[PDB]
Amino acid sequence: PLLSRMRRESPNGALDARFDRVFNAIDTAIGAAMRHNCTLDELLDLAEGLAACEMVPSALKQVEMVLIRSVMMHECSPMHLRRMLQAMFTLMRTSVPQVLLQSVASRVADYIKEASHMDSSSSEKVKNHEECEQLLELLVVLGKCGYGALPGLVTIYWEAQLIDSMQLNPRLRCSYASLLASAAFALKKHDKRAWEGLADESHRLFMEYTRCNKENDIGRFAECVTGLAVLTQIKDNTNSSDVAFLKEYLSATSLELKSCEVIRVQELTDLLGRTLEWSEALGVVAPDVVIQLEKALFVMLENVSHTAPGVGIPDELVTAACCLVDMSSASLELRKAAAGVVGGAIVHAEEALETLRSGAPTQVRPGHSFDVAALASAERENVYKNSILQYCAALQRSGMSTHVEEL
Amino acid sequence: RLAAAAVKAAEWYAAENRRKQKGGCTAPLWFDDTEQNLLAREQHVRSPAYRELHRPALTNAAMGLYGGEPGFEKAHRVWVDPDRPHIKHIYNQTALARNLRYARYGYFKRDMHLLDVDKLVRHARLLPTPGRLLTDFLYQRVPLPDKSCAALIRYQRQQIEMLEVWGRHASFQCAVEMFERMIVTNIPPVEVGVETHGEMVLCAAACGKWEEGWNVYANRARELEKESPESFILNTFFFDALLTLCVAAGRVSEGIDTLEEVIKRNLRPRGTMLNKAMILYSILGEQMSKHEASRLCEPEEVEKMGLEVWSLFDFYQLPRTTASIEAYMRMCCAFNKPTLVLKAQGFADASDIRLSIECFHWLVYAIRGVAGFGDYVMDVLSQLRPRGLTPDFVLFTLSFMYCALQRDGELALAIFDQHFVHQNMNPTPEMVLLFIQACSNCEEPTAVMLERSETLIKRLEAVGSSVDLISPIYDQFLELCAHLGAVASGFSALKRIVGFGKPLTTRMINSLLLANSNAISSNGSLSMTEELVGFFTLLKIRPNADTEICVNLCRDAFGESPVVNDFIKVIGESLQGDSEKGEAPQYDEDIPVIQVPPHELRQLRTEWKLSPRDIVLRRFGQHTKPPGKAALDVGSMRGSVIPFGRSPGEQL
Amino acid sequence: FDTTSPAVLAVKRALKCRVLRNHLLTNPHNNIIKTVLANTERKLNHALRRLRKVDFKKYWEIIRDHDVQDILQPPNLVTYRQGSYWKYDWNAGLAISTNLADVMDPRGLNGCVETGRSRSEVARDLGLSYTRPLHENEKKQLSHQAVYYERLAKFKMEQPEAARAMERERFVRKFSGMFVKMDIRSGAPDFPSTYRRLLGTKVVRWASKRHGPN
Amino acid sequence: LKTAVVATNHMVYYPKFNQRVSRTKRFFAHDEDLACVEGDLVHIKQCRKISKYKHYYVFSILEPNVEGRERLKLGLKAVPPPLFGYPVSRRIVKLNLTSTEG
């Protein structure tokens, strides 16, 4: 925690090189401790520290092994599970170990079963809400990780429905509403018996969260918009007061963070599309927030293409540009920036094709058949050919091809 | 019903305990059949006579002063209990203190009257056959008790299970002859007890004779128990033997009845007994699944019974072992509960369980019908190495079975690329077929999949094989070539098929036609279409609806040759005639995917019943023919060793 | 046509040993079979050691499959503690055959000749970790130090008079000890061994002149 | 703990017989991070005095014992203990296969 505090206080996002020896000592200590005896509290504190200060340990596998050994212990709490899952999600960046994920899923299924068996007899609704909030947080962090059976777990948790009386924080309300909406969509697709109740509950929770009309973080706003969109798609029922409240919320929400990341540019583009279609459906446009996020992403669009033309444009950025070109409710400056970046991607792909055709004789293997090597070369060319073809189609769905020709 | 029986027995035992306490306060709800035996052992080892007999050698100061006094110049005789030695390295290979020769049966014949037969069986060298052992005991005229009779029968059972499958009958006959001798020997006093009957049941189970074991020896033991009250009480060992016989013979109802009898008799079961019960429930569930596939306790009822057995495992405070984990995983796989399989694996890894490779076999087999677990499979394979385990052909076959079922292909390719190639093991035809099935049924196949399939086929042909999956393997390879557009590879596999001598199939020709249709870029044309279409007439192979679809696709891909058009007309007429004859058009049936449990996956290992302890301790009396005077002789050392010796060269 | 692979030889030797032992089970009076069994067991041991050294994957698979975990064990402690069981690998030409890169990281297996740092120091500087799986007793050894330190500190902070009395008595005996001076005799690492002339005739504290491998 | 016992070989020369023999000596090598497993071919070097009988340290591990490491991972001892060993006395240590009554 001390190192994390110092890193945060540092002007940039990383510490000085003088602490490389400290990090090396910590890595050696972790390597020794994994073999040595270790307790659940120490493991949780270590995971919290590694989440707080970005640090990939040298082993990174003995740690998850001991986490497997500890997750199914009888002393593990739902708060311990959500804490360790948050730490592992932050470390792995949506690439958490699926063995740990499934172990946590089985543990939370057992926990919700025990909670259903106990709380009904023991009730003290607010007192049981202390553990119910921990279970809800574990479910929401599991969903943020991206577990497969999240809709089923959410359905079981709502069958328990021990989190009533809106005693939870607004962020938890919105997250639970989004989880309920996703579970309702899956239940409608597979077994539509209980979909209606889940959809109605999620709609009511979103109404309760949005009636405050306060500005919210980017992630919370995007999740709320996604939940509202999926709820409207599945239920096809809305209220005039609700749409007025949502228009007020859209007007009152702004861009809290000006930090733009090419990692999250796809999420930003998806959020922009969702907000644009939602505003078009409602009938009231909220230009301010969408304009702010559009210019925030346009900054990176300009910087990547212009500052470093020789350096390869990110493929995620290229895909986001392709996804944002074909829409019709976006600004011409964004269209121009997307055209420029996709033109840079096209010229990079053509250069790659030329270099591959020049360096082909270095991959030919005499042991292969004449068709097998031909197929390998064909696919190596066809990946680029298909990428260029789809970029050409995306540009043909707009009128910036003249800008591309000019450049 | 087992949980209800357990709670009823517990409450009845508590009521009886309270009644007898009032007549004459926490007490166990069950009865332990081993607590009195361990208590007797503890009292025996803590008795002063045992402590004085098994004591460390006297030191030099204890013996006397310095040396030279006869009788007090060496430590006195030291006796060691082999089961609980007070010293390390009981035996030694010194020159003057070799004691391995002093451990053979001939030396214990002198004290055979006080001898413990189980200790003799477990710790002795050059023992005779068990029949000769019993004959020698009777000749010495010693009063063999139940423990001695059971020890002799257990020695015979060890010999039986050591012997091969086709050599069990003679040993079983020897066992029954020994049993008859023990029964009919009135003098010296020889008693045949519950333990001896259980050991005979174990012999019958090891040989594989349910009719000879259940209806004879168990019946005799029960008759003795009912004839003599409390003099022939049935221990947990007898019912463990009964459950072993039930598992060996496949009897599930009898095993459940025996376990229920154990529960009702108000005595705690054993971990081995509960493992056997779970195995029997797994067998019942597998039989029920087979019957349903062909399409009578309810599946929900048998699932509940398995769950209540697993609950009883902790109800009786019985620790769970690796065998318990394997049995529970097998039962859950039979009942199709992959979530419970994963939960059981997590529980085992939690406190202390050395998970065996069979546990991961069951883990992979449980999720065969579940999607979104390729990353879990990869992580399991990666975690195999830190646990001291290595993947084998059975586990690779299970993984490729999962890949073929999920038709993902990319997972199978990654598994082969980053786990299998490092193993350098011979692939099996089932493994190769599953890999090719996954790589063909996947979406968006790649040329690397074709390269890997060709490599696997070449390696399989280079190595040996006994089973014959050549036709399905090449059919799936041709389907993969059809999906990829590898017309040249598909046509070249025909030479391999011809070399193997297998006949061509309409499905293979349809795959060739599809390859020609979807290989517009690489190669293929109307000439290829004609060459392929000349097979049905020449090879007298019946056409198909898939054949018609593929030939129409090839026509649209390349053009209109008159021969192709005539074939299309004649195949349309023939399909119409076949529809008139029957009711539905024929189609190319897909190749079934193997989904057999890992316990019947053609294990490539029979049995090795070897014992390193017996090999090192030289049981059965091995001999090495040591060198003689050659090592000892060194020549005359009157002078120094100089080159060419002291007298180089000599004339006689 | 492969009949002479190391794994094939190992399994054939094991099967021959099994057949001979099964024969001796029913015919325990066959001296020639006993000698043949001894020879076959020795050959199986040689084949298994060679297979273990040249291909560990197949050896481990065979061991796990056939439950003979301790099939390769040293016979005698007297010879084992002199390293004659491991000298077999060197004498058989199987010393260096592991492909260390495939199964481990060779960076931390070598000391630095320039600075003199051992492999442990090299691994520490590189951030690596080479720690064998510790048993429960070893974990207890590494874990009880902190527990005992906390116990002692708690006792000293909780019972001042008792700790003060104990420390004063310990200091008094240390100061009054006859050999407080740090001369050559006190600085000798092994007094009973080095000054073994004094034992018996003058000094009776040690009844033995040798306690370790020196 | 933190100590590895290493048996090394040296050469003794007999001029009368004109031959040499390899004798064995044991040393208490030092390993800090507990990396040495029984069966490892190690290179050791002299150093300062570490204990009453420790003045060597494991400079490098030439050949790690994969079998020992895998057995430790599996939970067994690195090397199974030998069944033979040292005698406790000149008198032959006879077994006691007697019942409690006898």
Q: Which of B159, B164, B620 sits opposite C34 (nearest CB)?
A: B620
- Chain centroid to Cα B273, Å, comes to 18
Asked if A209 and A180 touch (Cβ cutoff 8 Å), the reply is no
Q: Would you state the structure tokens that stand for residue A116, as one six-digit string?
A: 């259903």
Please give, rounded to a whole number of angstroms, the shortest distance from the CA of C1 to a CA of chain D: 30
Residue D99 with chain B: CB contacts under 8 Å: 114-116
Asked if B348 and B359 touch (Cβ cutoff 8 Å), the reply is yes
CA distance D6 to D29: 7
Say if the Cβ atoms of B485 and A98 lie within 8 Å: no
Packed helices A98-122 and A62-71: angle between N→C axes, nearest 10 degrees:
20
Per-residue DSSP letters for A21-56?
Answer: HHHHHHHHHHHHHHHS---HHHHHHHHHHHHHTT--
At residue C86, what is the residue type?
A: W
A59 touches chain C (CB under 8 A): yes
Please give, rounded to a whole number of angstroms, the shortest distance from the CA of D7 to a CA of chain B: 21
Residue D32 with chain C: CB contacts under 8 Å: 118, 120-121, 124
Q: Where are the alpha helices (DSSP H) in A123-194?
A: 125-145, 150-160, 170-190
B68 Rama class: left (phi>0) / alpha (psi -120 to 50) / beta: left
Distances (CA, A) of A341 to A312, A352, A397, B46: 11, 16, 16, 87
CA distance B134 to B127: 12
Residue C143 with chain A: CB contacts under 8 Å: 36-37
Residue B447 with chain A: CB contacts under 8 Å: 372, 375-376, 378-379
CA distance A396 to A342: 12
Asked if D35 and D7 touch (Cβ cutoff 8 Å), the reply is no
Please give, rounded to a whole number of angstroms, the shortest distance from the CA of B401 to a CA of chain A: 20
Sign of CA dihedral B474, B476, B482, B486: negative
Residues linked to residue D84 through DSSP beta bridges, in sequence order: B91
- Chain centroid to Cα B438, Å, comes to 28
DSSP 8-state assignment for residue D12: E
Q: Would you state the structure tokens that stand for residue B499, as one six-digit string?
A: 């070399």
Residue A34 with chain C: CB contacts under 8 Å: 129
A27 touches chain C (CB under 8 A): yes
Residue with tokens 């002291």, as numbered in its chain? B646
- Chain centroid to Cα A333, Å, comes to 27
**What is the maximal distance between C-alpha atoms in chain B?**
119
Q: Which of B375, B492, B522 sits opposite A98 (nearest CB)?
A: B375
Q: Would you state the structure tokens that stand for residue B360, as one six-digit string?
A: 């991961």
CA distance C213 to B17: 63
The experimental method behind these coordinates is: cryo-EM
Asked if D7 and C82 touch (Cβ cutoff 8 Å), the reply is yes
- Subunits adjacent to chain D (3 or more Cβ pairs under 8 Å): B, C
Please give, rounded to a whole number of angstroms, the shortest distance from the CA of A371 to a CA of chain B: 6
CA distance B408 to B412: 7
CA distance B613 to D76: 16
Q: How many contiguous H segments (helices) and E segments (strands) does chain C have?
A: 11, 0
Q: Where are the alpha helices (DSSP H) in B387-505?
A: 393-406, 410-415, 421-423, 429-441, 447-462, 470-484, 487-500
CA end-to-end distance (rounded Å), chain D: 44
Q: Are strands D3-14 and B79-80 parallel, antiparallel or unpaired?
A: unpaired
A180 three-class SS:
helix
CA distance B270 to B30: 12
Per-residue DSSP letters for B328-378?
Answer: HHHHHHHTT-HHHHHHHHHHHHHSS----HHHHHHHHHHTTT-SS-HHHHH
Asked if A218 and A200 touch (Cβ cutoff 8 Å), the reply is no
A36 touches chain C (CB under 8 A): yes
Name, in order, each residue with C-beta under 8 angstroms of A110's C-beta and a sequence gap of 6 or more: B343
D11 three-class SS:
strand
CA distance B394 to A366: 34
Say if the Cβ atoms of C129 and A36 lie within 8 Å: no
Residue C61 with chain B: CB contacts under 8 Å: 390, 392
Residue B488 with chain A: CB contacts under 8 Å: 369-371
CA distance B310 to B306: 6
CA distance B433 to B400: 9
C61 touches chain B (CB under 8 A): yes
Please tell me which residue of chain A has the smallest CA distance to C126: A24
B625 touches chain D (CB under 8 A): no
Nearest to B103 by CA among B113, B91, B114, B87: B91
Q: Would you state the structure tokens that stand for residue B218, as one six-digit string?
A: 């168990």
Mutate to test the interface with C, among D61, D65, D72, D73 (most CBs of C within 10 A): D61
Distances (CA, A) of C84 to B100, B631, C70, C77, C89: 22, 20, 18, 10, 10
**Could you give phi then psi for residue B385, rounded to 5 degrees?**
-65, -50
Say if the Cβ atoms of A107 and B350 lie within 8 Å: no
Per-residue DSSP letters for A221-266?
Answer: HHHHHHHHHHHHHHH----HHHHHHHHHHHHH---------SSSHH
Mutate to test the interface with C, among A28, A38, A39, A56 (most CBs of C within 10 A): A28
Say if the Cβ atoms of C134 and A24 lie within 8 Å: no
Say if the Cβ atoms of B486 and A372 lie within 8 Å: yes
Say if the Cβ atoms of A68 and B346 lie within 8 Å: yes
CA distance C135 to C153: 28
Asked if B408 and B399 touch (Cβ cutoff 8 Å), the reply is no
- Subunits adjacent to chain A (3 or more Cβ pairs under 8 Å): B, C
Q: Is the peptide bond before B188 cis (omega within 30 degrees of 0)?
A: yes
Residue with tokens 């007007």, as numbered in its chain? A251
C199 three-class SS:
strand
Q: Would you state the structure tokens that stand for residue B428, as one six-digit string?
A: 């099996």
Residue with tokens 């209990």, as numbered in its chain? B81
Asked if A152 and A107 touch (Cβ cutoff 8 Å), the reply is no
Say if the Cβ atoms of A59 and C124 lie within 8 Å: no
Nearest to A246 by CA among A291, A300, A283: A283
Residue C18's Cβ-count burial label (10 Å; 0-12, 13-18, 19+) is buried
Q: In chain D, positions 16-35, which contact chain C (CB-CB < 8 Å)?
A: 24-28, 31-35
CB hemisphere CA count around B91 (13 angstroms): 21
